[PDB]
């Protein structure tokens, strides 16, 4: 059985989590886990309260780690528990992933350095001080990463994600199972299409948030230096 | 405060819930209920656990009610209790809603009789026996209600209303905040654009389902001609 693993920790964003979660637990032979430091209630950046269903300690050697983003990242860029894990599981994972936001905690924990990658649109400046390649694309591969943005990023590479673990066939046949066929009422999910008011605005909500994660960064930085 | 609430029923398609909440949730001066029979935990199809907040009973009135769907569905087509309370919440209700098999549970408590509505492409031809007007297309609007195909379905709908409670620009921002620019890597969301073959093997492992969600159709819809 495929064993795919999601980090599950406080104030995740939990589309990010949850889309992929439907979208690969449709696949046959394949395990999904929710990973936190224990089993128990973990809450998302919503209020929605979410189960973990695995600790580090117990967690079976993946094929597939997700890292989810939200407000929580910032403290986990300076979890050494978490980070230790997310790199003793990449080093034999198939896949190494991340939605949002979540590539900044891959970035903390090392896993970037000379990688090509992409973030948030808001936060995409702290790739680089994380060794990064910044692109500015919306799924970015380097070997065997694969970094997303939006908040449905992982239900898209998802579906690439099953047909190389499976075949072409059996992806389309979760899409359709599925009826994924999006179709969004507006054009505004990039800062090179929305309006620029609306851009402005967005800038100026996330602008504390920035702040606070340039301090973070610059932290998690000096640790990567030693 | 403008009042939400999803249906979070046993055997629920949690992707079907969780992508409008994460929307919805974003907004302003909202509040999002998880409603079912008492408050507690409740398990998706795919066994990710969830809990709901409020109880029928004490559930505040709601300006949105969203149906999920999921293989749940077919218990709750013929769940006294539950369509007794989505009645009285559609009658007051601003938005009334529902992602795929939803639809199904809002046929059976009556409320799409006349009413033009979509479902989930393997399961449309229990519309009409439920007094739907049946229509073949992803999003689809009468009056009040809103039906809408996919699993994602409401994550597009909830922009829409987003932009109808509030404004434009706030669905915009939301959006751009959110990152949220779906391109799926295939085209097989429809049974009119998937192969063929894809579409035979989807609608054999759907028969089952099917014929048990025919014998359940037809006693709610005897219910309904009483
Ligand atoms: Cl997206
Ligand atoms: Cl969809």
């Given at each position: 059985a495929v064993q795919i693993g999601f980090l599950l920790f406080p104030?995740?964003?939990q589309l990010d989590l949850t889309g992929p979660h439907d979208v690969l637990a449709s696949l046959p032979d394949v395990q999904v886990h929710l990973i936190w430091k224990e089993p128990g209630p973990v809450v998302a950046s919503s209020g929605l309260v979410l189960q973990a269903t695995t600790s580090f300690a117990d967690c079976?050697?993946?094929?597939v780690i997700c890292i989810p983003g939200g407000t929580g990242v910032g403290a986990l860029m300076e979890d050494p528990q978490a980070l230790a894990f997310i790199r003793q599981q990449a080093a034999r994972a198939r896949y190494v992933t991340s939605v949002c936001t979540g590539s900044l905690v891959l970035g903390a924990a090392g896993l970037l350095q000379g990688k090509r990658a992409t973030t948030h649109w808001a936060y995409h400046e702290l790739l680089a001080p994380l060794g990064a390649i910044p692109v500015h694309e919306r799924v970015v591969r380097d070997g065997n990463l694969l970094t997303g943005t939006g908040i449905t990023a992982g239900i898209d590479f998802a579906l690439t994600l099953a047909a190389e673990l499976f075949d072409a066939a059996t992806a389309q046949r979760v899409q359709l199972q599925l009826e994924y066929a999006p179709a969004p009422?507006?054009?505004?999910?990039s800062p090179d299409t929305a309006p620029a008011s609306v851009v402005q605005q967005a800038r100026q909500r996330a602008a504390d948030s920035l702040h606070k994660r340039r301090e973070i960064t610059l932290r998690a930085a000096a640790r990567l230096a030693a």
């Open positions: 104030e995740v964003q079976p050697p993946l094929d009422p507006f054009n505004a999910g």
